[PDB]
Amino acid sequence: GLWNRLEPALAYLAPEERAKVREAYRFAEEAHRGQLRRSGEPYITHPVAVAEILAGLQMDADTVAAGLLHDTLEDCGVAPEELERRFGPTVRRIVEGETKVSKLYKRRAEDLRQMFIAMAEDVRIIIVKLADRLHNLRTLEHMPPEKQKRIAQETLEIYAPLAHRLGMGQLKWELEDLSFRYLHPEAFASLSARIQATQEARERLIQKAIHLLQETLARDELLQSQLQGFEVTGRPKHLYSIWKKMEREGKTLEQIYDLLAVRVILDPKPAPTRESQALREKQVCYHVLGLVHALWQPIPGRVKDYIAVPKPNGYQSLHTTVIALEGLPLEVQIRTREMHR
Numbered sequence: 001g002l003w004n005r006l007e008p009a010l011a012y013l014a015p016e017e018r019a020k021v022r023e024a025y026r027f028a029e030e031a032h033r034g035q036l037r038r039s040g041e042p043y044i045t046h047p048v049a050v051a052e053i054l055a056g057l058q059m060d061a062d063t064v065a066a067g068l069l070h071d072t073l074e075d076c077g078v079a080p081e082e083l084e085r086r087f088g089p090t091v092r093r094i095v096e097g098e099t100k101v102s103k104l105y106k107r108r109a110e111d112l113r114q115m116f117i118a119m120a121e122d123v124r125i126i127i128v129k130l131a132d133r134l135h136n137l138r139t140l141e142h143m144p145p146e147k148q149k150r151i152a153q154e155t156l157e158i159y160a161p162l163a164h165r166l167g168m169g170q171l172k173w174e175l176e177d178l179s180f181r182y183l184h185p186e187a188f189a190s191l192s193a194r195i196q197a198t199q200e201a202r203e204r205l206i207q208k209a210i211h212l213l214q215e216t217l218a219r220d221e222l223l224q225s226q227l228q229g230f231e232v233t234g235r236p237k238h239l240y241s242i243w244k245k246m247e248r249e250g251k252t253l254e255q256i257y258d259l260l261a262v263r264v265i266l267d268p269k270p271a272p273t274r275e276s277q278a279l280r281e282k283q284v285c286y287h288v289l290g291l292v293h294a295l296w297q298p299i300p301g302r303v304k305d306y307i308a309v310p311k312p313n314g315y316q317s318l319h320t321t322v323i324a325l326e327g328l329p330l331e332v333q334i335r336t337r338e339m340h341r
């Protein structure tokens with residue numbers, strides 16, 4: 001069934017691992033047979049969509065499998081002993097933990113308390129709860145408008161930061177943005193309608209900018225001579241982070257440069273002495289700034305030199321807001337590998 005949708009995403013797993021995931025889906029589909037969600041949809045769609053979220057993150061075989069089974073214990077005729085017998089103790093461990101920790105669709109102080117108590121078992125239990133939470137938020141239109149606000153708050157306070165700390169930034173932004181939609185819809189609808197383009201169009205522009213910079217840097221002869229390699233990463237600013245700093249700093253949306261930002265992480269070639277290495281570390285950063293300014297037109301008064309004036313948090317990097325692509329303000333950040341975090 002819905003399996004033919006999940007199967008391609010599981011290409012990264014060994015054949016034996018994929019068979020485990022199919023045996024898990026076949027068991028979940030048998031266990032969730034005849035069950036429905038709040039949306040008229042059969043229950044199996046939920047554990048498959050959670051297993052999809054985990055598979056997109058290239059998660060552990062037992063983790064993907066545990067995502068298909070994460071609900072087979074709550075008021076279900078499945079004994080935890082059967083999961084240990086069939087899928088091992090690791091799958092059983094995660095699944096018990098995700099069931100015991102307040103489940104999917106239910107004070108919230110006790111459910112956030114249990115979230116920590118499961119922290120001793122393995123962050124693996126959480127990961128699944130993060131995938132589950134993301135899917136729940138994606139299908140929050142089938143929830144009373146009160147319950148919608150309870151979930152959104154919890155997500156912003158507990159899960160989005162946990163995703164952040166686990167290094168799952170694409171999970172983090174989506175968790176934040178869906179939470180923002182249901183928590184403050186008036187602010188969400190105002191800001192979203194203002195932003196003419198969708199996240200599809202945003203990521204397309206960022207990748208055009210990344211290609212333009214990557215090819216411009218690789219074509220500079222003198223730079224590549226003092227360089228070992230480089231990395232051009234992008235980001236479109238997400239609605240929650242756009243609205244968060246407008247309130248925090250006081251700037252209008254027109255007064256946000258970050259709406260399309262790009263980082264240039266550079267690792268220089270090795271140097272004989274310790275000093276001629278620290279000198280090579282800087283010479284590269286300003287050389288990129290030049291090339292960047294010759295590629296995209298720089299905006300007046302937007303060069304921020306944190307190499308020469310580091311932030312009290314020890315932050316070193318060169319910043320410049322430019323006019324890139326279809327006449328759009330793009331922020332560029334130039335730093336070395338060492339100046340990175």
Ligand SMILES: Nc1nc2c(ncn2[C@@H]2O[C@H](COP(=O)(O)OP(=O)(O)O)[C@@H](OP(=O)(O)NP(=O)(O)O)[C@H]2O)c(=O)[nH]1
Pocket residue numbers: 241245257258304311313315319333
């Ligand atoms: N990853 C990272 N980046 C750091 C850090 N300190 C400063 N920055 C950079 O510096 C930026 C903050 O400083 P600034 O860019 O010099 O300030 P303005 O953009 O307001 O001119 C940061 O921007 P942001 O969080 O993506 N944008 P915000 O929503 O706050 O407007 C980031 O680009 C840091 O510790 N880590």
Ligand SMILES: Nc1ncnc2c1ncn2[C@@H]1O[C@H](COP(=O)(O)O)[C@@H](O)[C@H]1O
Pocket residue numbers: 169233234235237238241258261262263331332333
């Ligand atoms: N210029 C940039 N290019 C790529 N990623 C960035 C850039 N600036 C910030 N980020 C990343 O985006 C996150 C913060 O972005 P924000 O949505 O503005 O709060 C962090 O995880 C940063 O690593």
Ligand SMILES: [Mg+2]
Pocket residue numbers: none
């Ligand atoms: Mg500023």
Ligand SMILES: [Mg+2]
Pocket residue numbers: none
């Ligand atoms: Mg940032």
Ligand SMILES: [Mn+2]
Pocket residue numbers: 046070071103104105132
């Ligand atoms: Mn669930």
